[PDB]
């Protein structure tokens, strides 16, 4: 019928899990006006610049005649932001019961300062829901008793109409919706500190990483392009023995080579020892911890905590066969190698095949990345003292009841056989976008992303205004890895990201 | 729209916890007439000296289809003060069920001796609620079994309008609301 | 010819053309006259609002000439006139002297 | 005004370069009906399933009062496909002059068999343009005299309206528009046979490649996932010396490991010779060709044409240090290594650190990819005899006046210093899609893609129904590499892809 059928039916937006353990007064939908709500509108809005009117919002719950409880509805005017307190209720509101099978549908009228709302106006009328009266249940007791879900649909109000038709091509002055970061599919994900695909999650209280990490304003504390490619550096043949300290050749960070690893040696170690031990091979898996016993040991081997990497030797004047490569970042005074945490154009050591005293100079070329030195079960990047900052220290603490995560990756080792992994802050594909794009997100509203395994388990992940990953569970566990994700939008970080995991 | 939007929507007033251990007949809202009810009115009243008409009162409970019980509603005329006894019920009343999801909204009509109510008149019409029939619950037993809450909103009746406009500064003869200690 | 809505700034690339446009020929002796409709966020535009509707022109198809060869072959000029639209009217009458909050046009250096 | 402003103005579609050397009668717009034309419609159509009516088409040329020539317009009914012959004109047509400054605008009325057109119906009314009378120019002479361009816009006809509103989520039965393959940006492109970013184009008459190559029907002659990751194989320690022949561990091709290189040794060579020569180092660049002279030589070094790759050794029972890796695919009868072209679960050789006669077995683990053996200026994959087929031989000859290309990549070498490159068939990101998606394209209509450097140069690339890259120039040259692409749609491969390069 009408060429505007969407301007008629209802589209789903989001839904939340109202738990019986959720104390009186607690926000549930900080959702605000603006065509960013409904997807159709949001899509259509790509062709205009002007919007006005309101948006109807139908939503309901599936309460059982047993339950009892009431939800509140309040239309927050522009310029104010709702707080998760009670006082919010000393405001004209609309009570709402859990039994009511009839889904409620009211409208968020647009009160405006201007005539027409510029696409980007993030300051508009808003509506919210708060648990008036707790959710009671006749068979209380232990654990998270229960709690039903609540959905929320959306339909463009009647009085809602656009206005200014933009001419195609004239780049948008603001930024697209952040619901386009993580790829819907677990397959191609891969860490940002290491080119391996993720295979697990890390529930932590703190997170820190600058190398290849990008901010939401496109800025980056880092020192390297959001991609993994070979590292080409020119080192001046020392004539004596191993040297290090070789400045890069072509990178978007004066000195500090784009692609150069992350951490540094956790102790004033020296460069030497052939196949330096860490004892017992064949004695596979008798070893994790602190060397397990006297005979059997867990860590030494001289150049420990070193980044292994194939490498093509230059030749300058002459002499062949690549041969080595063992790197990191620290000060190379003498034949020692004290660790620096601050990274500058004077801390890039390596190992070589220099040789011959004519003092032939400017050796090598390139080297990649393959492994690292088996420092026990230390998932690289778990301590500030080990992460190398260029100046600043990008991080994030537990905002709201949410906790920060990492992305348990996997890093091959050498001397041993094959093992150990390493964390990760941003799913590579993300950073990639961050740097190449430019969005808009409230410094208090994450970027709700749904994750789901192959059974039923599912949880949400958020994105910090800085660019980190958050979770609403105290601990997550094992789940079928044929994972796939999705995007919801934004929600005040002050609310937990529900999940049906465990 | 109307420069009097408050004279339209409902504002919260107070709410109480109706427990299943609360014996038959027990007051819950000794609340009385007078602009002191709704905050908007109460605030606006600061500019007048005269008020009249009634005030509508919407309020409800969130009962579960399981529960059973009835609440009573009674409009106590001025000059009398409700007692927490049963006999109160041998008076025209309006029964009320815990299941009813529909929130009730009736009015407290202003019966008056005078023409216009002086701001301070603490002797006016009044409304109250009493637990007609206990609150029963199929899974009784030990401790304070359970008991749901009940809210109460307020909206200025239609026939409610002030009257005498006081000139600013002329100190108020009575006293402000104690909700400021 | 393309009418760029407010909040965006035209780039000297091609993609600009994957937008509703109006082709224009070099032969057409008839001078074209269209309007730049004002789409606005507010009700009335404050004198200083530098963020408004906009129009632009881009060379769709190169300028060809049957006698090519060396040097800057040739190339003709193009003019542009202006007339206040009908629906264009002011609104707030400022009282003299009340210093202007913004700044005069730089065409006076 | 109208919430349907697009249903009013005109949108650009495509334009062509009408040359004065273009002989009488030659198609220029095989364009056919269907919302796939206009982008707005095409986009909107995502929400329906039914469309009907016609589409208006405004387009014109910028002819100079000097020129002379006429273009023809013909509305080809459904079920027939226009031929690039003259006879096409013995059909009711509409003549068209080069001088006419007034842009013509007619409609392609929808004649239909059914009531409503199912989204996928590729058999509908169609319109085309053919050069009635050559393009004449008073100052003829040498070279490609001249020739002006012609554009073509589109606007949804009035009588054009959709019909069936599909419910979201119910996966589309057909396939999206192929205008979404190549990434708009030269940056992240990288070859499909090698993980290096492209840096040049190869104008060739023939093309062949199966490994990591995908068809348009999602099928692949290949033997490996459209991605680059380490190759893990288990080889049975021979006890004697070097072995090879080790079956994979986990790949979607029985035997043939996913990721295993492409070509094989071009001669019955053996496994030996330490730093086997190919003479003169330091004698840099005195050497390309056929060894240049007696003293100086260009190719031998025993294990020539071998794929170099770091590799982590297993250990089975015992004994350490990775150490080697040099691979390819051929039969390993004895200590010889004759080349097989046909690849089966019995042709995967390597080099090792087996040792000790207890006959300790099942050695190694993994190995990656770094280099190859300097076979002169041979851009790997330039001869059928060198490319390894699993059974079939995917390729493409010069369809129409168009020529096939490759993607001159870059592959590091060893013994020398650093040099030589290698071809490539599909821009990786492409194959990636091909395998993960499912589109629709006429076996005679490419996928027009525009390429542009940083000056002005620009040309088009097409996609074969099989999945190859084509060009409309006999030779392309050097151009500023800050390249970026785009997508147009589809055009009968029988037409050349114009370009403003050279």
Author numbering:
A (entry chain C), D (entry chain O): 161 to 662
B (entry chain K): 161 to 341
C (entry chain E): 233 to 341
What does the paper say about this structure?
The crystal belongs to the cubic space group P213 with a cell parameter of 358.3 Å. It became obvious that here was no electron density for the N-terminal 37 residues which correspond roughly to the NTA domain. In the T = 3 capsid these residues are involved in inter-subunit contacts interlocking the shell of VP1 capsid proteins. VP1 forms a closely packed shell without any significant openings. The particle has an outer biggest dimension of 295 Å at the position of the spikes, whereas the shell extends only to a diameter of 185 Å. But in order to adapt to the T = 1 shell, the relative positions of the S and P domains change from the ones observed in the T = 3 structure. A comparison of these different oligomers in the T = 1 and the T = 3 structures confirm the conservation of the contacts within the oligomers. The conservation of the arrangement of the VP1 capsomers around the 2-fold, the 5-fold and the 3-fold icosahedral axes between the native T = 3 virus particles and the T = 1 VLPs shows that the antigenicity of the protein is conserved and that the use of the T = 1 particles for vaccination is a pertinent approach.
The Vesivirus feline calicivirus (FCV) belongs to the family of Caliciviridae which carry a positive strand RNA genome which is enclosed in a capsid composed of 180 copies of the major capsid protein forming an icosahedral T = 3 shell. Feline Junctional Adhesion Molecule-A (fJAM-A) was identified as a cellular receptor for FCV. We observed that the majority of the FCV VLPs obtained from the expression of VP1 in the baculovirus system are small sub-viral particles made of 60 subunits with T = 1 symmetry different from viral capsids.
